[PDB]
CSV table of C-alpha atoms and ligand atoms in Angstrom, one decimal:
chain,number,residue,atom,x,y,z
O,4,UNK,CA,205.9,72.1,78.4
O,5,UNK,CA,202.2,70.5,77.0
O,6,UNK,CA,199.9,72.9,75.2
O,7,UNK,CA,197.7,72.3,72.8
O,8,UNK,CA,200.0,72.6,69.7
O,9,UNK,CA,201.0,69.5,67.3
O,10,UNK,CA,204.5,68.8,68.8
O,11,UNK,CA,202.7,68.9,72.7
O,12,UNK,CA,199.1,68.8,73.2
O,13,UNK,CA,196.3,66.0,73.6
O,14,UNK,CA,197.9,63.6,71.7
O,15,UNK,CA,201.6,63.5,73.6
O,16,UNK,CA,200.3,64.0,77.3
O,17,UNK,CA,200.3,60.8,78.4
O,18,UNK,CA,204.2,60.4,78.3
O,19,UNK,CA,204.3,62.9,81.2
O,20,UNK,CA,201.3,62.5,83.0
O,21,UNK,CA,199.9,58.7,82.3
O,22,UNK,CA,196.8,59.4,83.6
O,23,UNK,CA,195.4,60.6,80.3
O,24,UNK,CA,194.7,57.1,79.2
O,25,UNK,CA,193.1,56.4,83.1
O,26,UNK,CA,189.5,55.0,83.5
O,27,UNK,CA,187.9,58.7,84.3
O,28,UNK,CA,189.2,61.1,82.1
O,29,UNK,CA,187.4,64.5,80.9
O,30,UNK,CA,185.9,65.7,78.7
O,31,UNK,CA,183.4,63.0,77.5
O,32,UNK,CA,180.7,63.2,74.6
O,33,UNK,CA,177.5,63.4,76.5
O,34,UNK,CA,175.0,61.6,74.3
O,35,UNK,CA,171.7,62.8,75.3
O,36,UNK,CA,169.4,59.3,74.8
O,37,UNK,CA,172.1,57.1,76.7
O,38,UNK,CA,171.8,59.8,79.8
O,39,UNK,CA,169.3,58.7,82.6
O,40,UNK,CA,167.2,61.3,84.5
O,41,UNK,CA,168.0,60.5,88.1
O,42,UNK,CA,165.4,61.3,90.4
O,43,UNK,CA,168.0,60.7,93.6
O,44,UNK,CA,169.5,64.4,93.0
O,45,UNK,CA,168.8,67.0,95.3
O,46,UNK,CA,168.6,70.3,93.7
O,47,UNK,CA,171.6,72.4,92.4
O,48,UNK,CA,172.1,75.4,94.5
O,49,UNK,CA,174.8,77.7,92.8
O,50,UNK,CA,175.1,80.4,96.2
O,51,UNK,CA,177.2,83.7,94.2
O,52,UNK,CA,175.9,86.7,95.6
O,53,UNK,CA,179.1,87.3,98.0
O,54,UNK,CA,181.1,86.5,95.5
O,55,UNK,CA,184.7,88.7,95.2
O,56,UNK,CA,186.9,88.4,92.7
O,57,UNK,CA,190.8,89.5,92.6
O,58,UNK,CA,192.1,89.1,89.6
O,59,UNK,CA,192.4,87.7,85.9
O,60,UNK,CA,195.5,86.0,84.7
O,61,UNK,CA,197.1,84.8,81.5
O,62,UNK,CA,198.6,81.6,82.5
O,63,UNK,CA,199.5,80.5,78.9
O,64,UNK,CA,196.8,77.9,78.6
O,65,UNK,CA,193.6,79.9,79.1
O,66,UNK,CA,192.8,83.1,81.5
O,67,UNK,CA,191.7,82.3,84.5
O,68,UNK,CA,189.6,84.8,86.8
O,69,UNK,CA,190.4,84.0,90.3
O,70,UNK,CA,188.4,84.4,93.3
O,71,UNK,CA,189.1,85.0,97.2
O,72,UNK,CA,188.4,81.6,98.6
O,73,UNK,CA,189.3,81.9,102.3
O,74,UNK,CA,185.6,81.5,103.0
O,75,UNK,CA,182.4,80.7,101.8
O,76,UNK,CA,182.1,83.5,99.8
O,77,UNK,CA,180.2,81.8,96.5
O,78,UNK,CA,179.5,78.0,96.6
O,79,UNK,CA,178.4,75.6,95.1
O,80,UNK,CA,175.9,73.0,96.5
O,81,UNK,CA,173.0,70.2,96.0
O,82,UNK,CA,172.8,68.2,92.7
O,83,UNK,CA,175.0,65.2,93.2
O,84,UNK,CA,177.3,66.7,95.4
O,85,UNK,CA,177.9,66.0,99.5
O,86,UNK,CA,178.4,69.2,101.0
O,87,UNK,CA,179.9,72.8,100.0
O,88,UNK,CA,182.3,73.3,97.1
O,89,UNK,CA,183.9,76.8,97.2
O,90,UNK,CA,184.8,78.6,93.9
O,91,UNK,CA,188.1,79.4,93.1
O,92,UNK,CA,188.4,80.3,89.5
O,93,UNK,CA,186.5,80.5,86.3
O,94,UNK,CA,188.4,80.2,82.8
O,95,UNK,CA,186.8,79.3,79.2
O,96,UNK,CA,188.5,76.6,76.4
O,97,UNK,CA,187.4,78.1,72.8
O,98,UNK,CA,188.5,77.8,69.4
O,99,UNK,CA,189.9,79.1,66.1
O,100,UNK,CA,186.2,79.1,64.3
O,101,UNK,CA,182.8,78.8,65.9
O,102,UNK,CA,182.3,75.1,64.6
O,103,UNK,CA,184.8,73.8,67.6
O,104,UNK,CA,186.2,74.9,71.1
O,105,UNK,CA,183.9,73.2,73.8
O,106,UNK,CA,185.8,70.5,75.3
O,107,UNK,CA,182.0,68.5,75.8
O,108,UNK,CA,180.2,67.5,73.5
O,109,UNK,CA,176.3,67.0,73.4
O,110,UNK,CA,175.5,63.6,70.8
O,111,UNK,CA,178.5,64.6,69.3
O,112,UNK,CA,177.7,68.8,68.7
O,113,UNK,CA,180.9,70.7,69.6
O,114,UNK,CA,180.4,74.5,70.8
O,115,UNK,CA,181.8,77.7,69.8
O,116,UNK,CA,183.6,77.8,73.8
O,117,UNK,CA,183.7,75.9,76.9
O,118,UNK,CA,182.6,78.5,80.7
O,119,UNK,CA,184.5,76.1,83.5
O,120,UNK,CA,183.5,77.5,86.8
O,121,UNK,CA,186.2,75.6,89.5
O,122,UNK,CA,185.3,74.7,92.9
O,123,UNK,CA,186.4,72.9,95.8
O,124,UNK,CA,185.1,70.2,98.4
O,125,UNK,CA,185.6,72.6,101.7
O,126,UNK,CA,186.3,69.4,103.9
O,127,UNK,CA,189.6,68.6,102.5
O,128,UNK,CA,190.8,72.4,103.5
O,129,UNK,CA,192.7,73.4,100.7
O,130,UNK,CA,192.7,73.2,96.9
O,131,UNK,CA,196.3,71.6,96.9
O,132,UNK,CA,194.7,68.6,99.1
O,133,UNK,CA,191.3,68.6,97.6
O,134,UNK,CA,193.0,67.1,94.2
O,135,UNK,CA,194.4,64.0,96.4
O,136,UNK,CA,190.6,62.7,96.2
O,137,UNK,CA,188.0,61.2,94.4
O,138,UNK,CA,185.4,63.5,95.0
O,139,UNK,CA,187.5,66.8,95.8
O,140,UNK,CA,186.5,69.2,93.0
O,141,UNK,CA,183.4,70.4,90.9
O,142,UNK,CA,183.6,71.9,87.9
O,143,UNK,CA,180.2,73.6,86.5
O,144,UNK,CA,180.4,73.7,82.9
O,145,UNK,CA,178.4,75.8,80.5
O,146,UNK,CA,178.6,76.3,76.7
O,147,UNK,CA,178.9,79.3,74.8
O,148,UNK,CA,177.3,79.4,71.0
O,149,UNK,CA,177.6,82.2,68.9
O,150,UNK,CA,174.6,84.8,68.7
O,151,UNK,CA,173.5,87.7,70.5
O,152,UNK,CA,175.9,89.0,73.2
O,153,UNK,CA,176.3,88.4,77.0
O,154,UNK,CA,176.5,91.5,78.6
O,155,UNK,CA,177.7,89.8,81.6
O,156,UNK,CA,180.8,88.6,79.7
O,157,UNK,CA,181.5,92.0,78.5
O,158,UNK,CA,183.6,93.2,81.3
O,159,UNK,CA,186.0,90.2,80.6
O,160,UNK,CA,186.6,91.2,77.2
O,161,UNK,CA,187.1,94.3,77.8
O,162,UNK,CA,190.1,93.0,80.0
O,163,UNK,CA,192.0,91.1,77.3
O,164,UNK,CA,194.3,93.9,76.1
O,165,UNK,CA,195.9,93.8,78.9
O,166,UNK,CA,197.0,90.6,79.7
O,167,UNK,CA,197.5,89.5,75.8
O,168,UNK,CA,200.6,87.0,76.9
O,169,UNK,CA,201.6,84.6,79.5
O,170,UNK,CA,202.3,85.8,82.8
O,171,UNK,CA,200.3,89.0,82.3
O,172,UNK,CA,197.5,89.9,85.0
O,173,UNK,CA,195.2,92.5,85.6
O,174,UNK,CA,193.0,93.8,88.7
O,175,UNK,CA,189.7,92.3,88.3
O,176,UNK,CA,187.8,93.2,91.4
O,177,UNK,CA,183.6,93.4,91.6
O,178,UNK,CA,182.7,91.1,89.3
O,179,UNK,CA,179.2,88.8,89.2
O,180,UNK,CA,180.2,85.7,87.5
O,181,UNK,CA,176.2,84.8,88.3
O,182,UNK,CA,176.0,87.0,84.9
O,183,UNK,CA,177.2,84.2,83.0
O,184,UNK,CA,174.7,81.8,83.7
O,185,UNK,CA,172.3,80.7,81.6
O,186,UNK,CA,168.2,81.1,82.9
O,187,UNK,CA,167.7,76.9,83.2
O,188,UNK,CA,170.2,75.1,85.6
O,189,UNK,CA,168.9,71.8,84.2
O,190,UNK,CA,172.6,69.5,83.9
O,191,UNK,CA,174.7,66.2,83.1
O,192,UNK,CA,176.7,65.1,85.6
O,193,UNK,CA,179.7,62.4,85.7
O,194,UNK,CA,182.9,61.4,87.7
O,195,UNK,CA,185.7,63.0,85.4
O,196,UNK,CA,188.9,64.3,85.6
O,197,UNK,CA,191.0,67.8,84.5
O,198,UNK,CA,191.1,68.4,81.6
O,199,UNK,CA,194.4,69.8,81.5
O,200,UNK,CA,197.6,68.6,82.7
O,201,UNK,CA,197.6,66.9,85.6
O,202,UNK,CA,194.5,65.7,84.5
O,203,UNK,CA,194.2,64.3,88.3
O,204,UNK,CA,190.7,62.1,88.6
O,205,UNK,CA,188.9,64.3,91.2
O,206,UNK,CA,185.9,65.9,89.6
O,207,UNK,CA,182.7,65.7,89.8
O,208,UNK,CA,181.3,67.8,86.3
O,209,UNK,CA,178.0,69.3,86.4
O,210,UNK,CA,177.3,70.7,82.6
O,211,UNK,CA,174.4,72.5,82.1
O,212,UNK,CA,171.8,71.8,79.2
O,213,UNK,CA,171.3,75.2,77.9
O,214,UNK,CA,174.3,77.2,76.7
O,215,UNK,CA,174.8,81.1,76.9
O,216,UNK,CA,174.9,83.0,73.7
O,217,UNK,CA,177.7,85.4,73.1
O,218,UNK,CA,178.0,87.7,70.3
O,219,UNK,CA,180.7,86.7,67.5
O,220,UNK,CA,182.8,90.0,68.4
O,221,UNK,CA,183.2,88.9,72.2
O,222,UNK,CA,184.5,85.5,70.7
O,223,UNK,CA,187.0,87.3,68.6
O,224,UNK,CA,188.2,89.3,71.4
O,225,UNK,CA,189.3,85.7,73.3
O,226,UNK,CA,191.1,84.5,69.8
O,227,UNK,CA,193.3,87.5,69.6
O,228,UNK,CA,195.0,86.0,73.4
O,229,UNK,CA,198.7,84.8,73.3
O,230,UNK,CA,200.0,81.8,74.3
O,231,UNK,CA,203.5,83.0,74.4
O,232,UNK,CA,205.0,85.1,76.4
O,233,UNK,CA,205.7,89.5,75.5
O,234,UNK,CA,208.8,89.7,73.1
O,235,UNK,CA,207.9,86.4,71.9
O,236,UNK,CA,206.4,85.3,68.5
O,237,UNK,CA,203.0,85.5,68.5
O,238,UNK,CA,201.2,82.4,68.6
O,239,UNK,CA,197.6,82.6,69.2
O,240,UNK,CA,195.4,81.7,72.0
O,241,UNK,CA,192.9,79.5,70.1
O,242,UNK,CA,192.0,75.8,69.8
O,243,UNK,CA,193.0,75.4,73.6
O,244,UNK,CA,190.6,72.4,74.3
O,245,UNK,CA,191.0,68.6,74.8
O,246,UNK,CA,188.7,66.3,72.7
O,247,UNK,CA,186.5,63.8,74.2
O,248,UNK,CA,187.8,60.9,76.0
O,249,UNK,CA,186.2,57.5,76.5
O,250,UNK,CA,183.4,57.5,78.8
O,251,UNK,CA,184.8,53.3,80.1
O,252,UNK,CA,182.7,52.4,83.5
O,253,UNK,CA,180.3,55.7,83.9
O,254,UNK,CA,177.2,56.8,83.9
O,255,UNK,CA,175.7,60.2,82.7
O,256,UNK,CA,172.9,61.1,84.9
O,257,UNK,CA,170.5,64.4,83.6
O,258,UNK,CA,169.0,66.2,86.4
O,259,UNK,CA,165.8,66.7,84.5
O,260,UNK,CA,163.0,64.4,82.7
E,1,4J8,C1,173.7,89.0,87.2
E,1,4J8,C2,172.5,88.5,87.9
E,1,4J8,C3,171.4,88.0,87.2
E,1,4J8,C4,170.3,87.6,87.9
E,1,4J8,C5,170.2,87.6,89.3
E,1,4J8,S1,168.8,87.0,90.1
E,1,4J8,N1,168.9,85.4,90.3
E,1,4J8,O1,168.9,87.5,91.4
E,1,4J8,O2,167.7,87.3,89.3
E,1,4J8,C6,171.3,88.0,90.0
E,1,4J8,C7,172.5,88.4,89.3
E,2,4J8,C1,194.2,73.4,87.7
E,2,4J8,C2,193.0,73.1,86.8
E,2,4J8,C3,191.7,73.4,87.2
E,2,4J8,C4,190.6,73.1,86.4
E,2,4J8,C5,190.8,72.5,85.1
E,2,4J8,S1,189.4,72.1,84.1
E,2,4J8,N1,189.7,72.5,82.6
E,2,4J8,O1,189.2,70.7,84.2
E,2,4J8,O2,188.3,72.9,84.6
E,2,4J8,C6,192.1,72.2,84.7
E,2,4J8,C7,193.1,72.4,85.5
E,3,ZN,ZN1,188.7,74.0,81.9
């Protein structure tokens, strides 16, 4: 029953999962002069090429577009992480006007949208045990401001119409989500959380620098999503991102000088 509306979202969490107000919590303000280059991190190998896709769902809080993780298929590797992190979904955060959405923030600058590609740590076996540990997920972040379009994003758009409310999905087969990367893979990293209900303390979040533009219409497309459900009244899909938490005990290291 959380969302993100007055009567249930950021704000009211923490009765039902207490962990909201723990010592890790995502998303954080990244602020860019406190950040320290560290020259311990290998390099970040995002692996995509066998990527397959299966499907795009409206789960009520975002869409996610899920991926066939039964093997390495598209990974994630290198930066600060120990060993291979397999990709199982991708799903944005965005909001009602281009001024707000991301769920970072970059000395305080909030984005038009928030990319969150999910992956898990391959030596815990299975998502469902890989958030029982500190270091079991990865989450590769990207922000999305408002200019020309991505042509790589198009094919999700086009999508939308047909999974408008909750519990709608759609085929989504073939798709290159290395088409919504941006051309520098220079990155923030910290230990963080979810930032969604459970928000369970197992991430590692790797946010790259540069953001990806998209055009203002593709945006527009995401706004016109549903929370509810068909038959219900229409509440729209929009503002679905948590504000920055405090940062406590952590460091923000940048992968670049
Ligand atoms: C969509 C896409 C863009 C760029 C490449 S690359 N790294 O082989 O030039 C591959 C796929
Ligand atoms: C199940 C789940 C997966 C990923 C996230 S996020 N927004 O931290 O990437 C939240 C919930
Ligand atoms: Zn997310």
């Amino acid at each position: 029953h959380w969302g993100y509306g007055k009567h249930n979202g950021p704000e009211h969490w923490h009765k039902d999962f207490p962990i909201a107000k723990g010592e890790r919590q995502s998303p954080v303000d990244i602020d860019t002069h406190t950040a320290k280059y560290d020259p311990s991190l290998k390099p970040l190998s995002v692996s995509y090429d066998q990527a397959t896709s299966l499907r795009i769902l409206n789960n009520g809080h975002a869409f996610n577009v899920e991926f066939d993780d039964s093997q390495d298929k598209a990974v994630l590797k290198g930066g600060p992480l120990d060993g291979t992190y397999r990709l199982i979904q991708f799903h944005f955060h965005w909001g009602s006007l281009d001024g707000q959405g991301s769920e970072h923030t970059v000395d305080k600058k909030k984005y038009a949208a928030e990319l969150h590609l999910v992956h898990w740590n391959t030596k815990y076996g299975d998502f469902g045990k890989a958030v029982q540990q500190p270091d079991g997920l990865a989450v590769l972040g990207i922000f999305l401001k408002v200019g020309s379009a991505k042509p790589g994003l198009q094919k999700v758009v086009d999508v939308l119409d047909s999974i408008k409310t909750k519990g709608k999905s759609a085929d989504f087969t073939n798709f290159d989500p290395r088409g919504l990367l941006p051309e520098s893979l220079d990155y923030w990293t910290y230990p963080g959380s979810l930032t969604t209900p459970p928000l369970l303390e197992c991430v590692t979040w790797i946010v790259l620098k540069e953001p990806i533009s998209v055009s203002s219409e593709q945006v527009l497309k995401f706004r016109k999503l549903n929370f509810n459900g068909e038959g219900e009244p229409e509440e729209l899909m929009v503002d679905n991102w948590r504000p920055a938490q405090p940062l406590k005990n952590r460091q923000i290291k940048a992968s670049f000088k």
